[PDB]
Structure formats: structure tokens, C-alpha cells
Curated annotation (Swiss-Prot), chain A:
All late proteins expressed from the major late promoter are produced by alternative splicing and alternative polyadenylation of the same gene giving rise to non-overlapping ORFs. A leader sequence is present in the N-terminus of all these mRNAs and is recognized by the viral shutoff protein to provide expression although conventional translation via ribosome scanning from the cap has been shut off in the host cell. Induction: Expressed in the late phase of the viral replicative cycle. It is found in: Virion; Host nucleus. Belongs to the adenoviridae hexon protein family. This is Hexon protein. Homotrimer. Interacts with the capsid vertex protein; this interaction binds the peripentonal hexons to the neighboring penton base. Interacts with the hexon-linking protein; this interaction tethers the hexons surrounding the penton to those situated in the central plate of the facet. Interacts with the hexon-interlacing protein; this interaction lashes the hexons together. Interacts with host dyneins DYNC1LI1 and DYNC1I2; this interaction might be involved in intracellular microtubule-dependent transport of incoming viral capsid. It comes from the Viruses. The gene is L3. It comes from Human adenovirus C serotype 5 (HAdV-5). Major capsid protein that self-associates to form 240 hexon trimers, each in the shape of a hexagon, building most of the pseudo T=25 capsid. Assembled into trimeric units with the help of the chaperone shutoff protein. Transported by pre-protein VI to the nucleus where it associates with other structural proteins to form an empty capsid. Might be involved, through its interaction with host dyneins, in the intracellular microtubule-dependent transport of incoming viral capsid to the nucleus.
UniProtKB/Swiss-Prot annotation, chain E:
Induction: Expressed in the late phase of the viral replicative cycle. It comes from the Viruses. This is Hexon protein. It is found in: Virion; Host nucleus. The chain holds residues 803 to 902 of 952 of the full protein. Homotrimer. Interacts with the capsid vertex protein; this interaction binds the peripentonal hexons to the neighboring penton base. Interacts with the hexon-linking protein; this interaction tethers the hexons surrounding the penton to those situated in the central plate of the facet. Interacts with the hexon-interlacing protein; this interaction lashes the hexons together. Interacts with host dyneins DYNC1LI1 and DYNC1I2; this interaction might be involved in intracellular microtubule-dependent transport of incoming viral capsid. The gene is L3. Major capsid protein that self-associates to form 240 hexon trimers, each in the shape of a hexagon, building most of the pseudo T=25 capsid. Assembled into trimeric units with the help of the chaperone shutoff protein. Transported by pre-protein VI to the nucleus where it associates with other structural proteins to form an empty capsid. Might be involved, through its interaction with host dyneins, in the intracellular microtubule-dependent transport of incoming viral capsid to the nucleus. The lineage of its organism: Viruses, Varidnaviria, Bamfordvirae, Preplasmiviricota, Tectiliviricetes. All late proteins expressed from the major late promoter are produced by alternative splicing and alternative polyadenylation of the same gene giving rise to non-overlapping ORFs. A leader sequence is present in the N-terminus of all these mRNAs and is recognized by the viral shutoff protein to provide expression although conventional translation via ribosome scanning from the cap has been shut off in the host cell.
UniProtKB/Swiss-Prot annotation, chain F:
Homotrimer. Interacts with the capsid vertex protein; this interaction binds the peripentonal hexons to the neighboring penton base. Interacts with the hexon-linking protein; this interaction tethers the hexons surrounding the penton to those situated in the central plate of the facet. Interacts with the hexon-interlacing protein; this interaction lashes the hexons together. Interacts with host dyneins DYNC1LI1 and DYNC1I2; this interaction might be involved in intracellular microtubule-dependent transport of incoming viral capsid. Major capsid protein that self-associates to form 240 hexon trimers, each in the shape of a hexagon, building most of the pseudo T=25 capsid. Assembled into trimeric units with the help of the chaperone shutoff protein. Transported by pre-protein VI to the nucleus where it associates with other structural proteins to form an empty capsid. Might be involved, through its interaction with host dyneins, in the intracellular microtubule-dependent transport of incoming viral capsid to the nucleus. All late proteins expressed from the major late promoter are produced by alternative splicing and alternative polyadenylation of the same gene giving rise to non-overlapping ORFs. A leader sequence is present in the N-terminus of all these mRNAs and is recognized by the viral shutoff protein to provide expression although conventional translation via ribosome scanning from the cap has been shut off in the host cell. It comes from Human adenovirus C serotype 5. It is found in: Virion; Host nucleus. Induction: Expressed in the late phase of the viral replicative cycle. Belongs to the adenoviridae hexon protein family. This is Hexon protein. Coiled coil: none annotated.
Length: 151, 45, 50, 80, 100, 50
């Protein structure tokens, strides 16, 4: 049920120190008889004064798209039919396709389930319609019967 | 009746439902015939 | 999508008609329907659809 | 049973956010060329670019992206 | 759901997954790997809403999970007894019949 | 009820520009009657292309 996500306000990450990178400034003081005369101030003040001009250093991220993309991959994409999968580049895999090892190592293209699939519609994915959805990890009942047994 | 309300700065409507009885009797004397008697009281039509 | 060929099933909602049991004969049954978008469709912000 | 064709028009939008380049910053423009004023009228084309692909060579025939045995193979400009 | 047309839609080009680049340079290329590429305009999918909305066809379906399909063998198909009216009739109970 | 984290795909944050720390590049043009001859250009282009 692809209804999109809140994205109205930009989200930002900042340095530990808030500010980020800075440069060294000497103080100056004005000459009072002039309209525009200045004199260094090296009285009780340090010659190595920290100033950042501008706003603080940042990176920007959309949170809900990252979460959505991870959801789509975790709960549907990894569970697509094996004809739609591929085998890893430069790594070993099982001879037998009936094994946990073959199911754990087959590689599915994330682009098959990207954030905009069936956007504005209520529709189950056609390749997942032939597939048993009780064979999935969000089975709360089977999960509960496993956890009756232990970790 | 006198109703007291909040000053609203854009026109509004007072919606009043007068609860009455609104019954109908339905009569079919011959094949393909239908007659009806309507009664609504208070407020006769 | 914006473009939609649809099919819809509409009930008669009028109290006298709908609980009626109708015996043998033939009957005229005629109704009228609205085509004005601001009534038949409904929008989230309540924008003038026309 | 009522059948017909509807058009809900261009003002409709059944989703929050954008579909297109969703992970991109809201400020960032696409890589671009612009004429900026120098005068030293004489306006200079400034580019803001990004080259992510490493090829084998660069000739007048483009960037070399491969070999057809003996012959070197270059990028098709139509999409590469 | 609604999907793009190719019968009365004249501009149509089928662009494969191998060259789709909606979100270029923010995510790995057809693997769950780290970010690859640069920023650039998005090419896929075509808009199904808006001023430039492409012509579309309609696909209908349903799911009905955890159930059996049911065809009761009865005259009017109601529950009027655990012993069925049609299971009792002189035609079907007192004669034998092959089914195809 | 610890069923561990849903974290298969890596998530990333990027600079305001989407690009970040860049270097300046000078446009160059080919000399078309030679295999691998090239010539510097500071005419209609800016000599500091990011």
C-alpha cells in the first residue's frame, strides 16, 4: 500500500562540536579620531582567536525514504523467486538449491523493489503472489513458538 | 426557541432536526397495481 | 491514476422502497443521477473540482 | 451497476514526497553549465561537474571503456 | 492499479533495469553495496498523475488467503439443514450417477 | 522481544551540494588532424571548472 512518506522538512547531521571547522583571527580595536582606522589588540586577549564565518558544517538526509527502501528490501525483495536472483561475484555457493546456504547467498537486485513501486495503489507484488507468505520472518506465531524453545 | 452561541466571523447555519413520526402504508390490490398512504405528524404535508 | 474506466454498484438508500417485498406485475422504476464533480467526487483539501 | 470513464485531472496526487531523486538534497541542483560575468559582453562558461567513471584512456573518439580484440572500444554517447 | 499503455501511447520506449537511474549516486548499482555514481535527472517511471500523465490501462485482481472455495450441493444454496435437501431427492439418492 | 535489526541495505547522508570537496579543472579542445594532439582553452569557458 504505497502512500509515500512525510518529507516536508529537511533533516540534517552536524559535527560533535556543533560549529565544525574554524580559522585564526587577531583582535582589532578602532582609532577613534578616524572614520575607518584600526589598531591590533594584543593586550589581555590571545593572538590565536577561533572564528567560523557562516553557518555550521552539515550533511542532509531524508530519514523516511532510507527506512522505506530498507523495509521494501527486508520484507519483500529478499523473498522474490530464485529465477529473479543471481549468484555472488567471486564467491562459492551451494550445489543444492534446497539448502539454507543457497537461500542465504543468492543475490537479488534492490532496484526490483524501489520506493515508488505501485505508488498510489493497493496491490500485492505479482512475483510474490505465487509465493507462500507464511514462509517469512514476520510470522509472529511461528516466532513465538521458536521463542518458547529459546535463542 | 432562543439558542446562544460563539461569535463566528464567517456565515454558519443552525441545523435543527424536529423528531416526528414518518410512516407509510403500502397496498397492492391487483397484478401491477400499487397504492400508498403517507402520514407525517407533527408537520402534515 | 487520474484516468479510470470503472464499474460501481449503487444501492437504493430510500427507506420506504428498500424494505419493500414486491408481488406480481410490471412496474415503472425511474431515477435521476447527478454529474457535478464537487458532489460525486470528494477531495482532501476540498478544492473546486470543476 | 454503473459503468463509465472518469478523469480525476492533473491536480490529483495520491502520495507524500516525490518519486524522483528522493535521496537527493532539496538544495542541490543537477550538474550544470552557466555563463558568468567576467568582463576581463564577455561572459565565461563555468561548469559544476562530477566524473565518477574510470576508463582506460581518453582520445578524441571519447573515453575507452573496453577492447574488441586488437581494436580499442569507446563509450556510446547516446547513453554512456 | 494503473500501468502505462503501449496501444494508443505513441512515445513509448521500454527502458530495462540495467539503465534505470532514479536516485543515481546515492545507492549501489544492482547490488545491496555502497553508493555508486553521480547526481543527475531521473528517467523512470513515467508519471501516472499530473499535467503530462501518460495514457494507462487497468489491471484488476484479488487475494483470498486461508480459505476454501465452497460449492454446497443444495437447491437454493442456503443452510436449512446439515442433511441437504438435494442429497434427499428421489432423482439423485435413489439412482446412481457418474461425474465428469 | 529482541528480534535484531532490519539493516541489510546501507543508509547514507550527503553534503548540501550532493558533491562536496572538488578540484579545479581547465577545459581543453582536440587538434582534429592529429591522433592525440590537444590545445588549452580560456576563451568563452572559465579556466577554473569545478
Amino acid at each position: 500500500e504505497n502512500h509515500g512518506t512525510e518529507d516536508e522538512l529537511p533533516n540534517y547531521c552536524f559535527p560533535l562540536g556543533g560549529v565544525g571547522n574554524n580559522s585564526t583571527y587577531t583582535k582589532v580595536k578602532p582609532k577613534t579620531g578616524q572614520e575607518n582606522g584600526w589598531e591590533k589588540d594584543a593586550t589581555e586577549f590571545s593572538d590565536k582567536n577561533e572564528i567560523r564565518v557562516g553557518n555550521n558544517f552539515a550533511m542532509e538526509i531524508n530519514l523516511n525514504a532510507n527506512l522505506w527502501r530498507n523495509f521494501l528490501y527486508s520484507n519483500i525483495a529478499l523473498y522474490l523467486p530464485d529465477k529473479l536472483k543471481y549468484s555472488p561475484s567471486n564467491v562459492k555457493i551451494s550445489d543444492n538449491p534446497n539448502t539454507y546456504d543457497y537461500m542465504n547467498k543468492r543475490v537479488v537486485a534492490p532496484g526490483l523493489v524501489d520506493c515508488y513501486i505501485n505508488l498510489g495503489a493497493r496491490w500485492s507484488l505479482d512475483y510474490m503472489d505465487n509465493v507462500n507468505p507464511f514462509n517469512h520472518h514476520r510470522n509472529a506465531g511461528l516466532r513465538y513458538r521458536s521463542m518458547l524453545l529459546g535463542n | 426557541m432562543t439558542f446562544e452561541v460563539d461569535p463566528m466571523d464567517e456565515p454558519t447555519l443552525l441545523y435543527v432536526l424536529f423528531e416526528v413520526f414518518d410512516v407509510v402504508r403500502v397496498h397492492r390490490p391487483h397484478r401491477g397495481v400499487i397504492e400508498t398512504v403517507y402520514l407525517r405528524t407533527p408537520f402534515s404535508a | 491514476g487520474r484516468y479510470v474506466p470503472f464499474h460501481i454498484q449503487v444501492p437504493q438508500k430510500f427507506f420506504a422502497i428498500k424494505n419493500l417485498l414486491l408481488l406480481p406485475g410490471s412496474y415503472t422504476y425511474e431515477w435521476n443521477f447527478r454529474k457535478d464533480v464537487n458532489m460525486v467526487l470528494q477531495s482532501s483539501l476540498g478544492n473546486d473540482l470543476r | 451497476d454503473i459503468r463509465g470513464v472518469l478523469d480525476r485531472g492533473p491536480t490529483f496526487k495520491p502520495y507524500s514526497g516525490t518519486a524522483y531523486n528522493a535521496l537527493a538534497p532539496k538544495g542541490a541542483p543537477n550538474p550544470c553549465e552557466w555563463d558568468e560575468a567576467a568582463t576581463a559582453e564577455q561572459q565565461k562558461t563555468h561548469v559544476f561537474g562530477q566524473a565518477p567513471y574510470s576508463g582506460i584512456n581518453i582520445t578524441k573518439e571519447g573515453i575507452q571503456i573496453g577492447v574488441e580484440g586488437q581494436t580499442p572500444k569507446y563509450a556510446d554517447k547516446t547513453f554512456q | 492499479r494503473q500501468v502505462v499503455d503501449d496501444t494508443k501511447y505513441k512515445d513509448y520506449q521500454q527502458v530495462g533495469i540495467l539503465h534505470q537511474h532514479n536516485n543515481s549516486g546515492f545507492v549501489g548499482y544492482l547490488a545491496p553495496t555502497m553508493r555508486e555514481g553521480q547526481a543527475y535527472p531521473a528517467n523512470f517511471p513515467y508519471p501516472l498523475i499530473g499535467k503530462t500523465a501518460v495514457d494507462s490501462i487497468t489491471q484488476k485482481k484479488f487475494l483470498c488467503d486461508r480459505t476454501l472455495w465452497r460449492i454446497p450441493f443444495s437447491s437454493n444454496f442456503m443452510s436449512m439443514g446439515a442433511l441437504t435437501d438435494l442429497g434427499q431427492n428421489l432423482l439423485y439418492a435413489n439412482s446412481a450417477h457418474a461425474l465428469d
